[PDB]
Amino acid sequence: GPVPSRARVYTDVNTHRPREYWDYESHVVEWGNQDDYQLVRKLGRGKYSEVFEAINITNNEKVVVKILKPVKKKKIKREIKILENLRGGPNIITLADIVKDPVSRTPALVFEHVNNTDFKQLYQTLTDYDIRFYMYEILKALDYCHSMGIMHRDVKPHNVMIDHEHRKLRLIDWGLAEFYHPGQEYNVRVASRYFKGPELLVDYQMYDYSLDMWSLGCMLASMIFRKEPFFHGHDNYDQLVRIAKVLGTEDLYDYIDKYNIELDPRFNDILGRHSRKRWERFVHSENQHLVSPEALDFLDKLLRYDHQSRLTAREAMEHPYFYTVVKD
Ligand SMILES: COc1ccc(/C=C2\S/C(=N\c3ccccc3)NC2=O)cc1O
């Protein structure tokens, strides 16, 4: 069978919490007043919800209303409990309220509103310093939720709301997030394809917080190199082949050999043999201004096959890449 794995940090956080903290199936939702919130315009539709900009008429302030499509009560309470546990943490989106939507017949989460700059203007104009700044702001959020027993499992540009005017960042969409318990086997069908960690792509279920750091590396590579997404697979199989053309196939085999994992035989025809590449290969005159030796070394230490060898969020915040960022 496969070799078990545990997180190298925050391993026992949920163990020594009261069972109330992580036993989300037992959570009792405390409902607000649906009539306090007036929908203004639809902002998005996902597979699991729709999201609206709205007004809270008791303070005339804008809020964002996420009305869940029908989903199992378990998963609704999971998201709710996680939002409540993490509320007030650095750069975590704030759950303001929860109300019963009369039309949907499902819960509606009420969030703080972020005046977000949308993501193509952000991708096109963020400077070297801005990338470092916002990376640091993201690591603050990730170190907080990891220290609180929670992995996000869906880190990607669209879940990072930035109001670039006020240099304000918020990590959103906790609907895939889970509590980390040592030895617990999880569902590998999480994260968007381009940000899925190798552990997911080789069907290794006993993963942990370090999955978020792989996804964060994919975001970082897309920004400093100006290739979004960076690993652009046509499906989950070709996703792993795209990674292996950069990180090499020899270390991929070392990885699965360490955990006594076996690749799906369907890779036999498509994986090939690939050397590991130096990151300088992706540097050119149109992304040069975003690359430094520090950037490449930091990236290199995030994008590791072995989830156990990636930097933790806290370790990443110690990296020289962030020495130039003004600390508050
Ligand atoms: C414009 O400002 C905001 C925008 C979004 C959120 C929070 C969200 S959005 C979400 N899920 C989605 C996303 C896209 C489509 C459908 C559902 N989950 C969250 O927590 C908070 C904001 O202040």
From Swiss-Prot:
Tissue specificity note: Expressed in gastric carcinoma tissue and the expression gradually increases with the progression of the carcinoma (at protein level).
UniProt: ATP binding residues: 43-51, 66
Enzyme class: transferase
Catalytic site positions: 154 (proton acceptor)
Activity regulation info: Constitutively active protein kinase whose activity is not directly affected by phosphorylation. Seems to be regulated by level of expression and localization.
Cellular localisation: Nucleus
Catalysed reaction equations from the record: L-seryl-[protein] + ATP = O-phospho-L-seryl-[protein] + ADP + H(+); L-threonyl-[protein] + ATP = O-phospho-L-threonyl-[protein] + ADP + H(+)
Transmembrane segments: none
Main location: nucleus
Alphabetized UniProt keyword annotations: Apoptosis, ATP-binding, Biological rhythms, Cell cycle, Disease variant, Intellectual disability, Kinase, Nucleotide-binding, Nucleus, Phosphoprotein, Serine/threonine-protein kinase, Transcription, Transcription regulation, Transferase, Wnt signaling pathway
Assembly and interaction partners: Heterotetramer composed of two catalytic subunits (alpha chain and/or alpha' chain) and two regulatory subunits (beta chains). The tetramer can exist as a combination of 2 alpha/2 beta, 2 alpha'/2 beta or 1 alpha/1 alpha'/2 beta subunits. Also part of a CK2-SPT16-SSRP1 complex composed of SSRP1, SUPT16H, CSNK2A1, CSNK2A2 and CSNK2B, which forms following UV irradiation. Interacts with RNPS1. Interacts with SNAI1. Interacts with PML (isoform PML-12). Interacts with CCAR2. Interacts with HIRIP3.
Family stated for the protein in its record: Belongs to the protein kinase superfamily. Ser/Thr protein kinase family. CK2 subfamily.
Disease: Okur-Chung neurodevelopmental syndrome: An autosomal dominant neurodevelopmental disorder characterized by developmental delay, intellectual disability, behavioral problems, hypotonia, speech problems, microcephaly, pachygyria and variable dysmorphic features.
Primary role: Catalytic subunit of a constitutively active serine/threonine-protein kinase complex that phosphorylates a large number of substrates containing acidic residues C-terminal to the phosphorylated serine or threonine. Regulates numerous cellular processes, such as cell cycle progression, apoptosis and transcription, as well as viral infection. May act as a regulatory node which integrates and coordinates numerous signals leading to an appropriate cellular response.
Name of the featured protein: Casein kinase II subunit alpha
Species assigned in the record: Homo sapiens (Human)
Gene field: CSNK2A1
Parent-protein start and end of this portion: 3 to 330 of 391
